[PDB]
Amino acid sequence: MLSEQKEIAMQVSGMTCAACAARIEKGLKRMPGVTDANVNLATETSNVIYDPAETGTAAIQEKIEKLGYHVVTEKAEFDIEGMTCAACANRIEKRLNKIEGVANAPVNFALETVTVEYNPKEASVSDLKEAVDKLGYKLKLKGEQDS
């Protein structure tokens, strides 16, 4: 009847052999909430699928780090005029949380801001804008555009 398996794309450095890629796919498929993983050798992009009730997004980046790599990540803060309450936070969060290349983002329900942890590899500030424009709020960047 029920279950709900969500995807993510992510990026990791240290995969200088096919055996490194193999050990990510063969490693992630062991987590009890995970079903599947595929990682593109040389390009560095890891693509992972799980039931988020027992294994959620941050556990994937930590299980990748647990091989002895560096998960090639950055974080920034974003400012969200038009978020006014927890349901408003949840409205953008249910895209921002992972989009198609973000590792994690929890959206604030009173401070009108979100901490975004991501891979600076395959998307940018245009796609973040267009993901929030779809709900109807805006993005300004914390120091990096207007603050």
Side-chain angles (χ1 to χ4, degrees):
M1 187 269 285
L2 54 63
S3 298
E4 59 183 325
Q5 291 175 343
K6 277 56 276 293
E7 65 274 78
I8 179 166
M10 193 179 291
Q11 194 120 334
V12 57
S13 191
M15 295 188 295
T16 210
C17 182
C20 306
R23 267 286 159 162
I24 281 154
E25 298 177 4
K26 290 174 51 162
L28 291 169
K29 191 259 149 163
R30 302 195 67 153
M31 320 221 266
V34 170
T35 180
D36 278 80
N38 296 258
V39 65
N40 203 114
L41 184 64
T43 312
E44 308 177 317
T45 318
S46 184
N47 313 269
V48 192
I49 308 92
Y50 45 83
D51 270 296
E54 158 159 33
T55 305
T57 195
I60 284 69
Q61 96 188 107
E62 204 211 74
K63 205 85 262 170
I64 289 168
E65 279 281 309
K66 254 67 182 285
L67 279 300
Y69 298 134
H70 294 123
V71 75
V72 274
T73 50
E74 189 184 278
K75 73 186 77 194
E77 295 175 59
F78 291 78
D79 193 85
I80 321 299
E81 182 165 41
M83 136 59 224
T84 53
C85 189
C88 316
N90 292 152
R91 256 193 291 158
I92 59 149
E93 193 171 70
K94 226 214 289 164
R95 291 297 183 274
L96 266 283
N97 194 252
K98 309 188 313 185
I99 311 175
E100 187 166 12
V102 178
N104 28 105
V107 181
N108 199 299
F109 70 96
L111 298 264
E112 297 169 21
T113 33
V114 50
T115 295
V116 179
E117 189 167 311
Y118 81 116
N119 294 113
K121 291 290 181 194
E122 272 295 346
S124 193
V125 188
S126 301
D127 309 296
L128 306 182
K129 264 255 187 162
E130 290 183 78
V132 172
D133 192 50
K134 188 69 176 197
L135 288 308
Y137 308 158
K138 62 65 161 330
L139 285 189
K140 303 290 289 192
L141 279 64
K142 186 71 67 202
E144 228 202 301
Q145 192 204 127
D146 202 283
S147 209

PDB file of all heavy atoms in Angstrom, residues 68-87:
ATOM      1  N   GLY A  68      36.365   7.811   3.518  1.00  0.00           N
ATOM      2  CA  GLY A  68      37.649   8.538   3.524  1.00  0.00           C
ATOM      3  C   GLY A  68      37.844   9.462   2.316  1.00  0.00           C
ATOM      4  O   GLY A  68      38.976   9.671   1.877  1.00  0.00           O
ATOM      5  N   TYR A  69      36.750   9.998   1.766  1.00  0.00           N
ATOM      6  CA  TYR A  69      36.744  10.965   0.659  1.00  0.00           C
ATOM      7  C   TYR A  69      36.658  12.420   1.169  1.00  0.00           C
ATOM      8  O   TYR A  69      36.803  12.675   2.367  1.00  0.00           O
ATOM      9  CB  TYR A  69      35.545  10.632  -0.251  1.00  0.00           C
ATOM     10  CG  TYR A  69      35.551   9.264  -0.906  1.00  0.00           C
ATOM     11  CD1 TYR A  69      34.375   8.493  -0.891  1.00  0.00           C
ATOM     12  CD2 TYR A  69      36.695   8.782  -1.576  1.00  0.00           C
ATOM     13  CE1 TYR A  69      34.343   7.240  -1.523  1.00  0.00           C
ATOM     14  CE2 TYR A  69      36.669   7.525  -2.211  1.00  0.00           C
ATOM     15  CZ  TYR A  69      35.488   6.750  -2.184  1.00  0.00           C
ATOM     16  OH  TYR A  69      35.446   5.540  -2.801  1.00  0.00           O
ATOM     17  N   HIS A  70      36.368  13.377   0.281  1.00  0.00           N
ATOM     18  CA  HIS A  70      35.784  14.661   0.682  1.00  0.00           C
ATOM     19  C   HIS A  70      34.505  14.925  -0.134  1.00  0.00           C
ATOM     20  O   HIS A  70      34.582  15.085  -1.355  1.00  0.00           O
ATOM     21  CB  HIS A  70      36.812  15.787   0.478  1.00  0.00           C
ATOM     22  CG  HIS A  70      38.015  15.689   1.386  1.00  0.00           C
ATOM     23  ND1 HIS A  70      39.334  15.616   1.001  1.00  0.00           N
ATOM     24  CD2 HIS A  70      37.996  15.636   2.753  1.00  0.00           C
ATOM     25  CE1 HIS A  70      40.088  15.514   2.108  1.00  0.00           C
ATOM     26  NE2 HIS A  70      39.317  15.532   3.209  1.00  0.00           N
ATOM     27  N   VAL A  71      33.334  14.977   0.508  1.00  0.00           N
ATOM     28  CA  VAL A  71      32.078  15.346  -0.173  1.00  0.00           C
ATOM     29  C   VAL A  71      32.124  16.849  -0.501  1.00  0.00           C
ATOM     30  O   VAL A  71      32.235  17.676   0.404  1.00  0.00           O
ATOM     31  CB  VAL A  71      30.828  14.874   0.613  1.00  0.00           C
ATOM     32  CG1 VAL A  71      30.484  15.686   1.873  1.00  0.00           C
ATOM     33  CG2 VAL A  71      29.600  14.817  -0.311  1.00  0.00           C
ATOM     34  N   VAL A  72      32.120  17.212  -1.792  1.00  0.00           N
ATOM     35  CA  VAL A  72      32.605  18.535  -2.262  1.00  0.00           C
ATOM     36  C   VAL A  72      31.501  19.578  -2.177  1.00  0.00           C
ATOM     37  O   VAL A  72      30.835  19.919  -3.157  1.00  0.00           O
ATOM     38  CB  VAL A  72      33.286  18.547  -3.651  1.00  0.00           C
ATOM     39  CG1 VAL A  72      34.770  18.201  -3.515  1.00  0.00           C
ATOM     40  CG2 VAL A  72      32.626  17.628  -4.685  1.00  0.00           C
ATOM     41  N   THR A  73      31.294  20.025  -0.942  1.00  0.00           N
ATOM     42  CA  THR A  73      30.120  20.756  -0.488  1.00  0.00           C
ATOM     43  C   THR A  73      30.501  22.136   0.021  1.00  0.00           C
ATOM     44  O   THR A  73      31.644  22.412   0.395  1.00  0.00           O
ATOM     45  CB  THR A  73      29.363  19.955   0.582  1.00  0.00           C
ATOM     46  OG1 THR A  73      30.230  19.512   1.599  1.00  0.00           O
ATOM     47  CG2 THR A  73      28.646  18.745  -0.013  1.00  0.00           C
ATOM     48  N   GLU A  74      29.506  23.010  -0.009  1.00  0.00           N
ATOM     49  CA  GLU A  74      29.563  24.391   0.445  1.00  0.00           C
ATOM     50  C   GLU A  74      28.207  24.712   1.089  1.00  0.00           C
ATOM     51  O   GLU A  74      27.198  24.113   0.716  1.00  0.00           O
ATOM     52  CB  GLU A  74      29.851  25.274  -0.783  1.00  0.00           C
ATOM     53  CG  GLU A  74      30.156  26.735  -0.448  1.00  0.00           C
ATOM     54  CD  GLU A  74      30.337  27.541  -1.730  1.00  0.00           C
ATOM     55  OE1 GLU A  74      31.439  27.512  -2.325  1.00  0.00           O
ATOM     56  OE2 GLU A  74      29.369  28.220  -2.140  1.00  0.00           O
ATOM     57  N   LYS A  75      28.146  25.658   2.029  1.00  0.00           N
ATOM     58  CA  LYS A  75      26.864  26.205   2.487  1.00  0.00           C
ATOM     59  C   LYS A  75      26.815  27.732   2.436  1.00  0.00           C
ATOM     60  O   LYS A  75      27.837  28.412   2.563  1.00  0.00           O
ATOM     61  CB  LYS A  75      26.459  25.645   3.866  1.00  0.00           C
ATOM     62  CG  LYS A  75      27.275  26.187   5.050  1.00  0.00           C
ATOM     63  CD  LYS A  75      26.898  25.471   6.358  1.00  0.00           C
ATOM     64  CE  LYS A  75      27.519  24.069   6.439  1.00  0.00           C
ATOM     65  NZ  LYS A  75      26.901  23.251   7.508  1.00  0.00           N
ATOM     66  N   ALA A  76      25.600  28.254   2.290  1.00  0.00           N
ATOM     67  CA  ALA A  76      25.264  29.670   2.358  1.00  0.00           C
ATOM     68  C   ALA A  76      23.870  29.857   2.977  1.00  0.00           C
ATOM     69  O   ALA A  76      23.088  28.905   3.092  1.00  0.00           O
ATOM     70  CB  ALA A  76      25.366  30.271   0.948  1.00  0.00           C
ATOM     71  N   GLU A  77      23.564  31.088   3.374  1.00  0.00           N
ATOM     72  CA  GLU A  77      22.249  31.481   3.876  1.00  0.00           C
ATOM     73  C   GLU A  77      21.512  32.354   2.852  1.00  0.00           C
ATOM     74  O   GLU A  77      22.108  33.192   2.170  1.00  0.00           O
ATOM     75  CB  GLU A  77      22.384  32.218   5.213  1.00  0.00           C
ATOM     76  CG  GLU A  77      22.943  31.328   6.329  1.00  0.00           C
ATOM     77  CD  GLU A  77      23.161  32.150   7.597  1.00  0.00           C
ATOM     78  OE1 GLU A  77      22.203  32.749   8.132  1.00  0.00           O
ATOM     79  OE2 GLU A  77      24.312  32.198   8.089  1.00  0.00           O
ATOM     80  N   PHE A  78      20.197  32.153   2.774  1.00  0.00           N
ATOM     81  CA  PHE A  78      19.288  32.838   1.861  1.00  0.00           C
ATOM     82  C   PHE A  78      18.107  33.437   2.635  1.00  0.00           C
ATOM     83  O   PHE A  78      17.645  32.865   3.627  1.00  0.00           O
ATOM     84  CB  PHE A  78      18.798  31.849   0.795  1.00  0.00           C
ATOM     85  CG  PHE A  78      19.851  31.390  -0.202  1.00  0.00           C
ATOM     86  CD1 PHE A  78      20.792  30.405   0.157  1.00  0.00           C
ATOM     87  CD2 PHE A  78      19.870  31.927  -1.503  1.00  0.00           C
ATOM     88  CE1 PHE A  78      21.758  29.977  -0.770  1.00  0.00           C
ATOM     89  CE2 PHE A  78      20.826  31.485  -2.436  1.00  0.00           C
ATOM     90  CZ  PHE A  78      21.779  30.522  -2.065  1.00  0.00           C
ATOM     91  N   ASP A  79      17.639  34.595   2.167  1.00  0.00           N
ATOM     92  CA  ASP A  79      16.646  35.466   2.811  1.00  0.00           C
ATOM     93  C   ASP A  79      15.315  35.518   2.029  1.00  0.00           C
ATOM     94  O   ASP A  79      15.309  35.767   0.816  1.00  0.00           O
ATOM     95  CB  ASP A  79      17.279  36.859   2.936  1.00  0.00           C
ATOM     96  CG  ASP A  79      16.477  37.763   3.860  1.00  0.00           C
ATOM     97  OD1 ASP A  79      16.710  37.697   5.092  1.00  0.00           O
ATOM     98  OD2 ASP A  79      15.623  38.531   3.371  1.00  0.00           O
ATOM     99  N   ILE A  80      14.199  35.237   2.723  1.00  0.00           N
ATOM    100  CA  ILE A  80      12.954  34.702   2.131  1.00  0.00           C
ATOM    101  C   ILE A  80      11.721  35.568   2.453  1.00  0.00           C
ATOM    102  O   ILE A  80      10.798  35.148   3.153  1.00  0.00           O
ATOM    103  CB  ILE A  80      12.721  33.229   2.579  1.00  0.00           C
ATOM    104  CG1 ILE A  80      13.991  32.351   2.665  1.00  0.00           C
ATOM    105  CG2 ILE A  80      11.681  32.568   1.648  1.00  0.00           C
ATOM    106  CD1 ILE A  80      14.729  32.181   1.336  1.00  0.00           C
ATOM    107  N   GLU A  81      11.666  36.782   1.909  1.00  0.00           N
ATOM    108  CA  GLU A  81      10.464  37.617   2.022  1.00  0.00           C
ATOM    109  C   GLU A  81       9.279  36.961   1.312  1.00  0.00           C
ATOM    110  O   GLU A  81       9.312  36.726   0.101  1.00  0.00           O
ATOM    111  CB  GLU A  81      10.708  39.009   1.449  1.00  0.00           C
ATOM    112  CG  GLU A  81       9.519  39.962   1.576  1.00  0.00           C
ATOM    113  CD  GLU A  81       9.940  41.412   1.336  1.00  0.00           C
ATOM    114  OE1 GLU A  81      10.744  41.676   0.411  1.00  0.00           O
ATOM    115  OE2 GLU A  81       9.475  42.295   2.095  1.00  0.00           O
ATOM    116  N   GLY A  82       8.224  36.704   2.083  1.00  0.00           N
ATOM    117  CA  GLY A  82       7.006  36.012   1.666  1.00  0.00           C
ATOM    118  C   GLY A  82       6.789  34.701   2.424  1.00  0.00           C
ATOM    119  O   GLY A  82       5.655  34.236   2.545  1.00  0.00           O
ATOM    120  N   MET A  83       7.843  34.131   3.017  1.00  0.00           N
ATOM    121  CA  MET A  83       7.687  33.165   4.105  1.00  0.00           C
ATOM    122  C   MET A  83       7.224  33.935   5.359  1.00  0.00           C
ATOM    123  O   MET A  83       7.866  34.903   5.757  1.00  0.00           O
ATOM    124  CB  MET A  83       8.987  32.342   4.261  1.00  0.00           C
ATOM    125  CG  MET A  83       9.479  32.123   5.692  1.00  0.00           C
ATOM    126  SD  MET A  83       8.324  31.286   6.801  1.00  0.00           S
ATOM    127  CE  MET A  83       8.562  32.359   8.236  1.00  0.00           C
ATOM    128  N   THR A  84       6.098  33.521   5.956  1.00  0.00           N
ATOM    129  CA  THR A  84       5.444  34.192   7.103  1.00  0.00           C
ATOM    130  C   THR A  84       5.088  33.270   8.272  1.00  0.00           C
ATOM    131  O   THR A  84       4.657  33.761   9.310  1.00  0.00           O
ATOM    132  CB  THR A  84       4.154  34.875   6.627  1.00  0.00           C
ATOM    133  OG1 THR A  84       3.363  33.924   5.947  1.00  0.00           O
ATOM    134  CG2 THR A  84       4.429  36.040   5.677  1.00  0.00           C
ATOM    135  N   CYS A  85       5.245  31.949   8.128  1.00  0.00           N
ATOM    136  CA  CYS A  85       4.742  30.918   9.046  1.00  0.00           C
ATOM    137  C   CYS A  85       5.284  29.526   8.657  1.00  0.00           C
ATOM    138  O   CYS A  85       5.794  29.347   7.551  1.00  0.00           O
ATOM    139  CB  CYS A  85       3.199  30.997   9.046  1.00  0.00           C
ATOM    140  SG  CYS A  85       2.457  29.949  10.328  1.00  0.00           S
ATOM    141  N   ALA A  86       5.146  28.523   9.528  1.00  0.00           N
ATOM    142  CA  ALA A  86       5.683  27.170   9.323  1.00  0.00           C
ATOM    143  C   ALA A  86       5.211  26.500   8.020  1.00  0.00           C
ATOM    144  O   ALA A  86       6.020  25.894   7.325  1.00  0.00           O
ATOM    145  CB  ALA A  86       5.336  26.321  10.552  1.00  0.00           C
ATOM    146  N   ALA A  87       3.940  26.663   7.639  1.00  0.00           N
ATOM    147  CA  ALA A  87       3.421  26.147   6.367  1.00  0.00           C
ATOM    148  C   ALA A  87       4.064  26.828   5.137  1.00  0.00           C
ATOM    149  O   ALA A  87       4.300  26.179   4.119  1.00  0.00           O
ATOM    150  CB  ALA A  87       1.896  26.299   6.388  1.00  0.00           C
TER     151      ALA A  87
END
